[PDB]
Amino acid sequence: GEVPIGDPKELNGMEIAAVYLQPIEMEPRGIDLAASLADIHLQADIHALKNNPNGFPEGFWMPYLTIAYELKNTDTGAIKRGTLMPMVADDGPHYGANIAMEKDKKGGFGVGNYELTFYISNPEKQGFGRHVDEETGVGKWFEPFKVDYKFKYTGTP
Amino acid sequence: GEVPIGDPKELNGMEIAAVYLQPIEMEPRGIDLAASLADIHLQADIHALKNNPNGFPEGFWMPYLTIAYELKNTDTGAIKRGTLMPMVADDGPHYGANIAMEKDKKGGFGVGNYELTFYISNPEKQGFGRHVDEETGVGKWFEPFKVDYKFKYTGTP
Numbered sequence: 041g042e043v044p045i046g047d048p049k050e051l052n053g054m055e056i057a058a059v060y061l062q063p064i065e066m067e068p069r070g071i072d073l074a075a076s077l078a079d080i081h082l083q084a085d086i087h088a089l090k091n092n093p094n095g096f097p098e099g100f101w102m103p104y105l106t107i108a109y110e111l112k113n114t115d116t117g118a119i120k121r122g123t124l125m126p127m128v129a130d131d132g133p134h135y136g137a138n139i140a141m142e143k144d145k146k147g148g149f150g151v152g153n154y155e156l157t158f159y160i161s162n163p164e165k166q167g168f169g170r171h172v173d174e175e176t177g178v179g180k181w182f183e184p185f186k187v188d189y190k191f192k193y194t195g196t197p
Numbered sequence: 198g199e200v201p202i203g204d205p206k207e208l209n210g211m212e213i214a215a216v217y218l219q220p221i222e223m224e225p226r227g228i229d230l231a232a233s234l235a236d237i238h239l240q241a242d243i244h245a246l247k248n249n250p251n252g253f254p255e256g257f258w259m260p261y262l263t264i265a266y267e268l269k270n271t272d273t274g275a276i277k278r279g280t281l282m283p284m285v286a287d288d289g290p291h292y293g294a295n296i297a298m299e300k301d302k303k304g305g306f307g308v309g310n311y312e313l314t315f316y317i318s319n320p321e322k323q324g325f326g327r328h329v330d331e332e333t334g335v336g337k338w339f340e341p342f343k344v345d346y347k348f349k350y351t352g353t354p
């Protein structure tokens with residue numbers, strides 16, 4: 041099952057929500073941390089708001105974003121970071137990564153209170169274009185930004 | 198303004214339509230042929246159908262596809278090849294490219310009868326991931342395939 045992380049944020053034309061669930065199995069193999077080595081799949085759910093200023097229809101998935109995460113256990117002080125990769129599951133596309141929590145050898149990533157940050161950059165960083173003509177053009181992309189959430193990690197689903 | 202190319206195809210859980218319009222100014226500069234040097238913008242509209250076998254909800258843009266094209270004037274024999282690149286306009290994301298027709302340097306790309314082929318590969322070729330576990334996984338991706346259109350080019354819209 042999915043566990044929502046905090047409240048979603050609306051900014052820069054997008055609704056940005058965080059969820060975690062049980063480790064998943066992703067193809068192609070060898071990119072994402074193997075399910076066997078993980079305790080959660082962390083997921084960023086990011087879709088266009090109404091009147092998205094970059095032309096994305098409401099509710100469309102926001103593609104080609106560059107997304108990193110920072111996860112901090114505030115009880116122990118442990119911090120880890122990584123990237124969320126684009127992929128598709130039965131409920132649609134998202135950005136995600138399997139993460140070791142209890143299993144992390146370094147330790148300190150167990151049940152407890154957590155702060156999560158997403159660091160997001162616009163699709164142009166990956167070569168995604170935008171029309172700028174009068175007839176069909178759209179507005180400028182957002183500058184790099186972050187969003188912050190707090191949640192209680194209750195253990196690997 | 199917008200000119201439909203042949204008839205849409207419905208394969209591999211996607212609707213695959215082709216259109217052309219006037220040349221467009223796109224950012225970032227340099228990725229694509231400058232509108233100055235082009236006569237059309239060639240565009241592929243590819244969205245998920247109902248019950249898409251790869252987890253995309255109905256109507257969602259299909260992202261991370263590799264779309265090569267081959268455009269042949271069957272009257273003159275002129276042939277040119279390229280790739281459509283992902284981008285967004287005020288009505289949503291698509292894959293497109295500016296193309297010189299009357300302005301082409303070798304010539305033979307004027308008004309007349311044309312054959313257009315799209316060579317399409319699945320998102321995994323660009324590293325887009327897919328859940329395969331039982332609870333959240335989706336079906337395998339289509340093998341690379343081609344779609345063919347026949348149309349009359351009447352000049353820049």
Ligand SMILES: [Cu+2]
Pocket residue numbers: 064081083127128129134135136137328
């Ligand atoms: Cu995932």
Ligand SMILES: [Cu+2]
Pocket residue numbers: 171221238240284286291292293294
């Ligand atoms: Cu375009």
